[PDB]
Assembly symmetry: none
Homo-oligomer: 155 residues x 5
Amino acid sequence: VFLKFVILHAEDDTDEALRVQNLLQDDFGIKPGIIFAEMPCGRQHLQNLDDAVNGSAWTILLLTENFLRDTWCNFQFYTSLMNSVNRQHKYNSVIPMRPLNNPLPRERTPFALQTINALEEESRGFPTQVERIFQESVYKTQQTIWKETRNMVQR
Amino acid sequence: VFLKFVILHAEDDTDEALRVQNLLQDDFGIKPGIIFAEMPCGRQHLQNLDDAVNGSAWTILLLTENFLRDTWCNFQFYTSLMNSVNRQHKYNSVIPMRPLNNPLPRERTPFALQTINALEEESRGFPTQVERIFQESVYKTQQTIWKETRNMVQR
Amino acid sequence: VFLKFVILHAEDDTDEALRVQNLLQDDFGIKPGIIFAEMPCGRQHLQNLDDAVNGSAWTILLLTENFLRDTWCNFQFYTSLMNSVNRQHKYNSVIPMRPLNNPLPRERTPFALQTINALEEESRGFPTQVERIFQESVYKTQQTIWKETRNMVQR
Amino acid sequence: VFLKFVILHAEDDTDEALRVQNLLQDDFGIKPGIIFAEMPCGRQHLQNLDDAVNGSAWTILLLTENFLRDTWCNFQFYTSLMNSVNRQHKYNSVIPMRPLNNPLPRERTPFALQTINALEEESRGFPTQVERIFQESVYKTQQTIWKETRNMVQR
Amino acid sequence: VFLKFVILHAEDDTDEALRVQNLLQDDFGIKPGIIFAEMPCGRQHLQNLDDAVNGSAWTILLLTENFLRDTWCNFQFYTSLMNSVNRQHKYNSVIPMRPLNNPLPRERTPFALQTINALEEESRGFPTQVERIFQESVYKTQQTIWKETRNMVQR
């Protein structure tokens, strides 16, 4: 399995993540895709995070007003940022998007996100920019590598 | 005999274990499966535990609010954890699941369980994640080995 | 009589038990202490086991390579494990220690022991950890109770 | 007892841990401090881990080239990470430090560690940064709480 | 602690940063001051960046020929630029200075820096312009605020 998109969320906002997940899968037909919670039960969350980073092309940060309020949440996506930096194959995989439900405002955004275009479903821009960018060839390039990039790990 | 699932329970909660056992067997058709109490009478509980660990693919921890309250109960599943660690054939066989009847809360969970996805029949997630995971091939792989893994013990 | 330590051994290894017994008594001055064989002649072994469990603070499992090879040997220390679980006064009295002479290896250890720190005279650790733990107050606490715990049985 | 530092190590590297332990204790006078192996014999390793987490101010990860190669080793420090996240009293207690003996290289570091400053005795930086940080008041603050934080557990 | 100056550098050029740091501290007596590497060990680099931005009056960009060659380096000082824009208290705190060791040439400078006076230790100008500008009152103004600006954060 390899995902077109993965949503990172706080459990308080899983309905929003789902809603987004639905919107992503349903409207765009962008499937398969996983939210952090679904990852195989009975395993370590950390290990699933690492595997999840590998298994997803793009990495959606559900920028909910209190997404930052829980410390470990800050820790989790930090590693994702590095992974985008580390591997060309994941370059810009980390997609900050303000939710509809209580988006994080610009007043206090962490500067790191301020340096990046943070999207929003409220905006006219989001769907056209996704359409223009999140396309077969862009995904095809990523997955084609991924599979062989993990065959090495299974030989 | 080899089990798809084995439930570990405290005698105070055997009705819940049964109910779960029924739900598992009845709804999913996941049969055969045993709860700790049923193991052959007249034998040592410890020895049955060891054999039970071998005889079951997955190992359900009935995380009842007072499941931890009895010390030996803590001892019992500790060994199961090791067995998951020890043998690939039992990797993640230990499935922490909060019951419906007075589940153990997150306030005081033993950190070890906190590191793991603990399931719950209250959740929307549990049945779909089981369906996606607890499937013929996954069980087939485990049992196929088990039988020969014990023929060695009976030659 | 109440013992600081009791050694459980197979007759094939009594020299090792003795050697250990000597080392324990001689080096540490930890006296008195008994090995399973010495228990009063002409009595039932089982009954001596029960009394021996009561009469000893700590309970050394001479983990010789074939200590497990004789079935009843497995049965004997099983009851000791329960007694540690049953009585606070005997909590952790059961001390698995790999001998010098052909210690049981980690390859096949019974998982129950794997969950526990099993000591070894080969290690640098064993003597310092004993010194730090097996001390007057720890023993004093146990014996002080024991005596009155059996006066009840003799009134 | 409460420790200024605790070293987490794989048994293959205990000499390095010791050497580090010596260097820490001897050069800086930072005493007392324990390595994972020393924890009271005859007890469960897991339980000692939990108590060890409580008993130490700082938590040194002996990042030896094969420290990650053993799975349970990965599991162990995962819980420590959470404990740093969970309790302010342990904030940043988890100190990743590359050993002298075959340090883990940056080529394959687990991203989580990549997000953190990992120290190294090879560097000019390590001793001055410790001196500037690991100081009476910082330790005093931690221990002063710890003692009362466990008096609650012993009342 | 509050710094007169902070140097931002790539690890390949730490000797230059040090040399500059020495020159700054030694020649001008401008102390204390920190280079990016020194920030407290065991913490997140990003968080230290944010705190470092607050803790320094002026922010030296070690414009080494390959300072831009590493992408995240570009990201880091971008946030600093904003902070100068955001807060009057940090207005022009960001001081681009070409090093002695392989300075970035004007041929390919990023236009943003081209709009700004970029200093150079090779020039006659640098020391007199620093003397005329980096003076007690200018620093006094900044620190006096800083301290109370963080008392708000610690009340």
